[PDB]
From a paper:
We reconstituted the methylation-competent elongation complex on a ligated nucleosome template that would represent transcription to bp 159 of a Widom 601 sequence, such that the nucleosome is located upstream of Pol II. The obtained data yielded a reconstruction that revealed Pol II at a resolution of 2.63 Å. In our structures, we observed 7 conserved residues of the SBR that bind to the DLD of [name]. In this conformation, the SBR of [name] is directed towards Pol II and [name]. Although the AID remains highly flexible, the C-terminus of the catalytic SET domain is orientated towards the DLD of [name] and indicates the AID and SBR of [name] likely remain tethered to [name]. [name] is tethered to [name] such that the AID does not prevent binding of the catalytic SET domain to the proximal H3 tail of nucleosome. When tethered to [name], the AID of [name] is unable to inhibit binding of the catalytic SET domain to a nucleosome that reassembles in the wake of Pol II transcription. In the first step, [name] binds to [name] through the SBR and positions the catalytic SET domain to the upstream edge of Pol II.
Residue numbers in the entry:
A (entry chain Z): 416 to 646
B (entry chain O): 2022 to 2030
C (entry chain M): 283 to 339, 350 to 430, 436 to 483, 515 to 761, 775 to 1077, 1084 to 1176, 1225 to 1310
D (entry chain G): 1 to 171
E (entry chain D): 14 to 49, 55 to 139
């Protein structure tokens, strides 16, 4: 048998005279855990084995699932039944039902950091010899690549390759002037009407903008070059 | 028994 | 899921099972009220805005009976719209056609929905009446008892709007007691109080009622336009009388009157008769006013879609046309414009104000006496109605009317989409200038002139038999480089030999861009070389729209289906398949991901309700698929045609997939329609709905199958009428063997022309089958030519279709006068400057239109390869050329000779004043 | 809930603003720097009205910039778990009701809504009526609620509500 | 851990003073009157919201409902939620705010509720 009680999670007592008491995990071990749960407003530590503990979480906090259909995804729990713990994914406002024992509690935001170092946040790629795109969100099996047309397509991890930056390229804007890459501009006209950002990559008719305040599309957006003004 | 008439021209 | 199994087992059309509100049988009383109610709302009530008659296929009161019959078939017999439209047309034509039947079907949902809410809302009223009866039988001026008229108002409701009025009314007078009633019945109280509850807590009921007319009495004076009910006149001044109601909430008589007037103003504004009478008056008189925001004055230029209406003054809503109101709401959400709907004419003129609606209705509540006693009350009365109209009714009526005008514009866009899809699906298989189908060579290419042209040969059955790559077919024969000509000669010879080896009947070329014209001229010349040499008969060379082919090439299906073929060559096959049968091809891009929405039906199709548009588009598939009929053996033999089974009447995607699955398990062809009952165990209701639409090609069968083959399966004759079809065939021969008799007639169909069907219809009616004139005429016509394809015969695209297809422009996007950006290609000898647009049109600027001043040498102002702003003056659709000007006087259009026509109600004074 | 605290912040100033009216110029750049921003500690801050005092400025060695720690007067909005507040309903869906508490948008799943409330996805106005069609909760309605959880997304809070607790409903 | 049920807030925010919907309505309206760089859309979405929920709009009615409640033994958390919610019965106030359970009697608490409902414009 195996047990998955990671540091920083919350467990309750399922049987005994001290039943229904939710505390934070400090000490982690295997079978003979003899855990030290930190309840609210209580400096003292109780003692419980793994056969007398249950992975429970109170309604309204962030949860990270390890194993399941939607494994590796974060969100907010709204109802916790005996086995179906429904939550709202932070990516889309849609249902997500998974198992509570394979779950964990972390109040940090789902960053989605790069592994190995073959790609990074806001990096130009080459899907087809006729189209170009940038990576905006690293998933578990797939990648959310944003093409030059302005839409995000779902590709596998090995289906896309790293494209070298065209740092010596120029284009035209709304005032019909020579605009290059790595410049802070404003997108007043176009699909992203009233937006602020920095250009990272350019193409025949499109610009790859990057921001930090925006949450949609991983904080990156693409518009035509003639829809930009110098900021 | 019944029969349809071919009276149509 | 379990629902998919339940849908498979249940003997009802899948679309009946997938309907939001389950279809329930109806008593004749409900069907009669529903038939009249649907007729009033869907066919008799004209649109508020000017809407084009979209019946591309005002209906009289006789339609009410036809709707009652149609609802009878759908709700009691569970027949879908196509079955009714094709096999029960004697009972619904000529008033209802297939599109009208879908309209009735969609309104049946709304009737059932209205009745469901109206019934439960009645249950609430019964509970409320019982609770008040208990409180009274176990009285303050503020206790209004729910009576029999209060119930009758609800029962007489004819629309969701009138229903909502009665609900808002109920909440105003009884909403405060709802939680008390429910707890007494045995739940915790919704708690917030509008200012009306404060006025009630202060006991102002005794004062509000003394203004004179009750809310209901005022409602009738409004409806009838005269003081039908005389205003009871209190003998005291209102400001003195207010002293009796002074309390902690209203410490002064002046404050008491504002509080009491607010209570009266809300009673008037929420009384159902007042709302109903005003709404009717509001829809008739309402004027729309539009002014641009700080943003709109800068962004809404001559090219912006909002240009024709950014400034509107006093425009009657009755004069908005088609989708124009949707464009207004979009421009408003973009923060460009501000819209205002008022029943009054806006202006600063004295007569303008004197003529306003408020000045008219205040007279229905004023008492015509000159005593100071009455005058000061009239002043209070003026402010009581004014607050009701300005703060509650005009805002709410403007919002309700805004939603209806917007709904009509959204419905127009949906109808415009379906009307475009209909025009695409109605095209029949190409027939050479036939029984083994047509071998088609589709040719697709990318817009880049360096990419190879790809050809795909599809046999008449829809199987891809071969493919070809041409690296130089895009080159031009008059190239300055000899090397291009020499290399292209090998590809020309390759295509000539490919045609010689495969002998296709028609070659389709992708409508990608203007180079498609060169490809067609070259292909026609190659074919012409075969013709002059008499080596092969003339091969058709057709330009085929590639929009559908692009969606195919980008679909997950087109890669999975042909994993080894490149994506450009994948658009070559869809172009070959599209000319063989457009309906089967369009069904390929109708995936579970709803890929259909990627087709550009209308410029605003993305701003309408997605679910309503999808239903309106699937109706076009269902209409044409059932008219054409679906061959089940073709579907099993060729996976390509399996997409149509889901649109067969009665089947749908779940039962459609299941039908193919059982025949796949048995590994047997569908030999006769009876096998749907004996092998797929298909129930009578689903069989009834689909049996007439499923084709079985009796010519493809043979050997042991000969033991049982009903020849009528090869026609649209419905199995319920096979007994009549056999009798009708036997009598045309005057035989004193049903199969032998029928075979002689099917081979010699002219003998049926002498058979008098009107005499036979009388016998079926006498036997109790009812009127059968149209059913017999269908059977006779069907036996005269089994499965005659009712689709419009294929025709090559005309000059207007070709221009739109290759430039991807429409008359609305590329019009005379429009401003554009173009690249200079050369100078004509100087007669003018040659240019090229992004959309590929080759523009020409006469020397006289190059500048305001006379320029003798164009080289002094423009250079080859240079981008220059120009204004279209004349469009030549045939030559793909436009006469452009670039004179500053024309570019800025100082005389307003080119600018798009402004609306008739455009506010030229506001436009000049804002500057 | 809306709260009242006077916070402090540090902003940088370029040499074009030096000279005698320096301290006067430092005030202006803060007015569009600490307005409408958010943190997981102080919450969503609405805006700054006036500036109390300017601390001592450290000139960055090598370049011309100088930073100035400024104390200002602003009113802040932080919703907390367990609070019961009012909101306006923006969208009703089969997964739940989505509402808006002033500068912040929220969501309440159908799971957190009482069992009496059934859906109305079919009618033109999306609502959740009851078995009695009595208390109808649709779009554009002043609905109270209970915050059960908060979340910060790049300087923007997105809390989560509930509606099973009593006296929480129709206006 | 930050839970309003037991009235626990961050140490730098615990010392804060709560505000009424009508009070911030006056402060926000005054800032709009002074500044209309112009005001942000984030500010406007606080204006329409606290407007719809500003139960009384005169300034003296703002300072009075605050001064009359702080005279009791309720916390400054209750000083704003009981001026924003405007509950009808004391049982409702105790249901909305859990800190009121057992702290005061129903009829005295009802008096505080009536003092707030009477000022509404």
């Amino acid at each position: 048998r195996e047990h998955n009680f990671q540091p920083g999670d919350n467990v309750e007592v399922c049987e005994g005279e001290l039943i229904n008491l939710q505390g934070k995990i400090l000490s982690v071990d295997g079978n003979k855990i003899t855990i030290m749960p930190k309840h609210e407003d209580l400096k003292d530590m109780l003692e419980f084995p793994a056969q007398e503990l249950r992975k429970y979480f109170k309604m309204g906090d962030h949860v990270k699932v390890i194993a399941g259909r939607f494994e590796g995804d974060t969100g907010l729990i709204v109802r916790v039944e005996e086995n179906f713990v429904i939550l709202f994914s932070d990516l889309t406002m849609h249902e997500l039902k998974v198992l509570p024992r394979d779950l964990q509690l972390c109040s940090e935001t789902a960053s989605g950091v790069d592994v190995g170092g073959q790609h990074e946040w806001g990096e130009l790629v080459q899907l087809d010899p006729q189209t170009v795109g940038v990576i905006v969100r690293l998933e578990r099996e797939t990648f959310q690549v944003l093409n030059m047309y302005g839409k995000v397509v779902t590709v596998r991890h090995q289906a896309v390759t790293r494209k070298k930056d065209n740092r010596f390229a120029v284009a035209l804007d709304s005032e019909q002037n020579n605009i290059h890459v790595k410049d802070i501009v404003k997108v007043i006209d176009g699909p992203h009407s009233g937006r602020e950002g920095e250009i990272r990559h350019l193409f025949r008719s499109f610009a790859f903008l990057h921001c930090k305040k925006l949450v949609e599309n991983g904080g990156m957006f693409v518009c035509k070059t003639r829809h930009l003004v110098l900021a | 028994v019944y029969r349809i008439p071919k009276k149509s021209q | 899921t379990d629902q998919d199994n339940e849908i498979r087992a249940t003997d009802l059309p899948e679309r009946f099972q997938l309907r939001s509100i389950p279809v329930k049988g109806a008593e004749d009383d409900e069907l009669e009220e529903e038939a009249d109610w649907i007729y009033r709302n869907a066919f008799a009530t004209p649109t508020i805005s000017l809407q084009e008659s979209c019946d591309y296929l005002r209906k009289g009161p006789s339609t009410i009976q036809k709707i009652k019959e149609a609802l009878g078939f759908m709700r009691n017999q569970h027949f879908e719209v196509p079955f009714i439209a094709f096999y029960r047309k004697e009972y619904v034509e000529p008033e209802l056609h297939i599109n009208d039947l879908w309209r009735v079907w969609q309104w049946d949902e709304k009737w059932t929905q209205l009745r469901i809410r109206k019934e439960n809302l009645t249950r609430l009223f019964e509970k409320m009446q019982a609770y008040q009866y208990e409180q009274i039988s176990a009285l303050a001026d503020g206790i209004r008892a729910l009576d029999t008229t209060d119930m009758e108002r609800l029962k007489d409701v004819q629309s969701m709007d009138e229903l909502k009025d009665v609900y808002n009314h109920f909440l105003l007078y009884y909403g405060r007691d709802i939680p008390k009633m429910q707890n007494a019945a045995k739940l915790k109280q919704a708690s917030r109080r509008d200012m009306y509850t404060i006025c009630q807590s202060a006991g102002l009921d005794g004062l509000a009622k003394k203004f004179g007319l009750t809310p209901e009495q005022f409602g009738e004076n409004l409806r009838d336009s005269y003081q039908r009910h005389e205003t009871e006149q209190f003998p005291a001044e209102p400001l003195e009388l207010a002293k009796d109601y002074v309390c902690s909430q209203f410490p002064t008589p002046e404050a008491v009157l504002e509080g009491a007037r607010y209570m009266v103003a809300l009673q008037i504004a929420r009384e159902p008769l007042v709302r109903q009478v005003l709404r009717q008056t509001f829809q008739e008189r309402a004027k729309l006013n539009i002014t641009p925001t700080k943003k709109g004055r800068k962004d809404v230029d001559e090219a912006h879609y909002a240009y024709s209406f950014k400034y509107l003054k006093n425009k009657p809503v009755k004069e908005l046309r088609d989708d124009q109101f949707l464009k207004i709401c979009l421009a408003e959400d973009e923060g460009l414009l501000t819209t205002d709907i008022s029943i009054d004419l806006k202006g600063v003129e004295g007569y303008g104000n004197d003529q306003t609606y408020f000045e008219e209705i205040k007279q229905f509540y004023y008492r015509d006496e000159f005593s100071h006693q009455v005058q000061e009350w009239n002043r209070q009365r003026t402010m009581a109605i004014e607050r009701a109209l300005q703060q509650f009714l005009y805002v709410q009526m403007a919002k309700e009317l805004k939603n209806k005008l917007l709904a009509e514009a959204k419905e127009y866009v949906i109808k415009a989409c379906s009307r475009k899809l209909y025009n695409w699906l109605r095209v029949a298989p190409y027939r050479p200038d036939q029984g083994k189908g047509i071998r088609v060579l589709g040719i697709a290419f990318s817009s880049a002139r360096d990419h190879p042209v790809f050809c795909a040969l599809v046999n008449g059955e829809g199987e891809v038999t071969d493919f070809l790559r041409l690296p130089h077919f895009t080159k031009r024969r008059t190239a300055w480089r000899e090397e291009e000509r020499e290399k292209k000669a090998q590809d020309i010879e390759t295509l000539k030999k490919f045609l010689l080896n495969k002998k296709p009947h028609v070659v389709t070329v992708a409508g990608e861009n203007r180079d498609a014209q060169m490809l067609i001229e070259d292909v026609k010349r190659i074919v012409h070389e075969l013709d002059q040499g008499q080596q092969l008969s003339s091969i058709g060379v057709e330009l085929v729209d590639n929009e559908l082919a692009i969606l195919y090439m980008n679909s997950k299906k087109s890669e999975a289906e042909f994993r080894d073929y490149p994506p450009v060559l994948r658009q070559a096959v869809s172009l070959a398949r599209r000319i063989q049968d457009p309906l089967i091809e369009f069904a390929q891009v109708c995936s579970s991901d709803e890929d259909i929405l990627c087709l550009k039906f209308h410029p605003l199709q993305e701003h309408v309700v997605k679910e309503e548009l999808l239903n309106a588009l699937y109706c076009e598939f269902i209409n044409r698929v059932n008219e054409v009929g679906v061959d089940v053996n073709r579907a099993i033999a060729h996976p390509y045609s399996q997409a149509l089974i889901q649109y067969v009447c009665g089947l749908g995607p779940r039962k459609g997939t299941h039908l193919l699955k059982i025949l796949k398990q048995n590994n047997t062809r569908l030999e006769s329609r009876t096998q749907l009952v004996t092998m797929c165990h298909m129930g009578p209701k689903v069989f009834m709905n689909c049996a007439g639409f499923l084709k079985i090609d009796t010519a493809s069968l043979g050997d042991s199958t000969d033991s049982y083959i009903e020849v009528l399966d090869g026609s649209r004759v419905h199995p319920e009428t096979y007994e009549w079809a056999r009798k009708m065939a036997v009598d045309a021969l005057e035989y004193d063997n049903p199969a032998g008799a029928l075979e002689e007639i099917l081979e010699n169909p002219e003998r049926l022309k002498d058979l008098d069907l009107d005499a036979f219809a009388e016998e079926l009616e006498r036997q109790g089958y009812g009127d059968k004139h149209i059913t017999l005429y269908d059977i006779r016509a069907e036996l005269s030519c089994r499965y005659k394809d009712l689709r419009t015969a294929y025709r090559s695209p005309n000059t207007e279709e070709i221009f739109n297809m290759l430039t991807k422009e429409t008359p609305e996007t590329f019009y005379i006068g429009k401003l554009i950006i173009c690249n200079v290609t050369g100078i004509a000898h100087a007669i003018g400057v040659k240019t090229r647009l992004d959309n590929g049109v080759t523009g020409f600027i006469p020397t006289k239109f190059l500048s305001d001043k006379v320029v003798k040498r164009p080289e002094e102002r423009v250079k080859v390869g240079m981008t220059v702003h120009c204004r279209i003056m004349k469009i030549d659709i045939e030559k793909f050329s436009a006469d452009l000007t670039c004179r500053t006087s024309d570019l800025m259009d100082r005389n307003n000779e080119w600018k798009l026509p402004k609306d008739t109600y455009y506010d030229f004074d506001a436009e000049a004043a804002d500057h | 809930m809306f709260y009242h605290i006077s916070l402090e912040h540090e902003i940088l100033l370029h040499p074009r603003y030096f000279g005698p009216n320096l301290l006067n110029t430092v005030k202006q750049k803060l007015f569009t720097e600490v307005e409408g921003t958010c943190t997981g500690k102080y919450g969503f801050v609405i805006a700054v009205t006036t500036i109390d005092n300017i601390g001592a400025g450290v000139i960055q060695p090598g370049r011309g910039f100088v930073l100035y720690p400024v104390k200002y007067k602003a009113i802040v909005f932080r919703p907390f778990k367990g609070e019961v507040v009012d909101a306006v309903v923006t969208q009703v869906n089969k997964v739940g009701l989505f509402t808006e508490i002033g500068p912040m948008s929220c969501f309440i799943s159908r799971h957190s809504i009482p069992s009496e409330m059934e859906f109305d996805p079919n009618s033109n106005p999306p609502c959740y009526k009851t078995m009695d069609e009595d208390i109808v909760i649709q779009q554009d309605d002043e609905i109270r609620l209970k915050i059960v959880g908060t979340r910060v997304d790049k300087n923007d809070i997105f809390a989560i509500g509930s509606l099973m607790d009593d006296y929480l409903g129709l206006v | 851990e930050e839970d309003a049920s037991q009235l626990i807030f961050p140490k730098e925010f615990e010392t804060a003073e709560t505000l009424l919907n009508s009070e911030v309505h006056m402060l926000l309206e005054h800032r709009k009157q002074q500044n209309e760089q112009e005001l942000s859309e984030v500010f406007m979405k606080t204006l329409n919201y606290t407007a719809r929920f500003s139960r009384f709009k005169n300034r003296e009615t703002i300072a009075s409902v605050r001064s009359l409640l702080l005279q009791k033994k309720l916390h400054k958390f209750e000083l704003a939620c009981l001026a924003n919610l405007c509950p009808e019965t004391a049982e409702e106030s105790k249901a909305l705010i859990p800190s009121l359970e057992g702290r005061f009697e129903d009829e005295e608490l009802q008096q505080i509720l009536d003092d707030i409902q009477t000022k509404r414009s």
